[PDB]
From a paper:
The deubiquitinase [name] in complex with SPATA2 is recruited to receptor signaling complexes by the [name] ligase LUBAC and regulates Met1- and Lys63-linked polyubiquitin and receptor signaling outcomes. Upstream of its C-terminal catalytic domain, [name] harbors three cytoskeleton-associated protein glycine-rich ([name]-Gly1/2/3) domains, which are ∼70-aa SRC homology 3 (SH3)-fold protein interaction domains known to bind to microtubules (Yan et al., 2015). Here, we report that the [name]-Gly2 and [name]-[name] of [name] are novel UBDs and demonstrate that [name]-[name] is indispensable for full [name] catalytic activity in vitro and for [name]-regulated NOD2 signaling in cells. [name]-Gly domains comprise a five-strand β sheet topology and show similarities to SH3 domains; a subset of SH3 domains binds Ub (Stamenova et al., 2007).
A detailed understanding of how [name] [name]-Gly domains bind Ub came from two crystal structures of the [name]-[name] domain bound to Ub determined at 1.7 and 1.9 Å resolution. To obtain crystals, we slightly extended the [name]-Gly domains C-terminally; crystal form 1 (aa 467–552, 1.7 Å) crystallized in the tetragonal space group P41212 and crystal form 2 (aa 467–565, 1.9 Å) crystallized in the orthorhombic space group P212121. Also, the Ub binding mode between the two structures is highly similar, with hydrophobic [name]-[name] residues Leu475 and Val487 engaging the Ile44 patch of Ub. In addition, hydrogen bonds are formed between [name]-[name] Arg488 and Glu507 with Ub Glu51 and Arg42, respectively. Chemical shift perturbation mapping of [name]-[name] bound to 3-fold molar excess of Ub revealed a comparable Ub interface in solution studies as compared to the crystal structures. Residues from [name]-[name] that engage with Ub are conserved among [name] orthologs, whereas Val551 is less well conserved. Mutation of Leu475 to either Pro (as in non-Ub binding [name]-Gly1) but also Arg (representative of [name]-Gly2 and most other [name]-Gly domains) abrogated Ub binding without significantly perturbing the structure of the [name]-Gly domain. Importantly, [name]-[name] L475P was still able to bind to the NEMO ZnF domain. Hence, while our data reveal [name] [name]-Gly2 and [name]-[name] to be novel UBDs, they interact with the Ub Ile44 patch distinctly, through either a central Leu475 ([name]-[name]) or through a central Phe288 ([name]-Gly2). Additionally, Ub-binding interfaces in either domain do not overlap with known binding sites for tubulin ([name]-Gly2) or NEMO ([name]-[name]), and the interactions may co-exist or potentially even cooperate.
Residue numbers in the entry: 467 to 479, 482 to 552
């Protein structure tokens, strides 16, 4: 959504911020998910696994899986203009 890819800085509007580490469609779902690596550990978060299956690897308790169509480029950085 909006040309998000792995490595993109994303936002899921209290907005959450994470870097997309994985995009795909787990078995059982009919929608594409983004697996986000968040900056800090979070309660309902894994180390890159979703419903038991591993999709990427990150530090303990930093992986959050959401619907890709719920993601937007991280607005904190979207307005950043370059040097001249």
């Amino acid at each position: 959504s909006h040309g998000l890819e792995v490595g993109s800085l994303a936002e899921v509007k209290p907005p959450f911020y994470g870097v997309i580490r994985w995009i795909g469609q787990p078995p059982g779902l009919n929608e594409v998910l983004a697996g986000l690596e968040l900056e800090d550990e979070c309660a309902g978060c894994t180390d890159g696994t979703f419903r038991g299956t591993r999709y990427f690897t990150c530090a303990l308790k930093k992986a959050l899986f959401v619907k890709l169509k719920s993601c937007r480029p991280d607005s904190r950085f979207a307005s950043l203009q370059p040097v001249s």
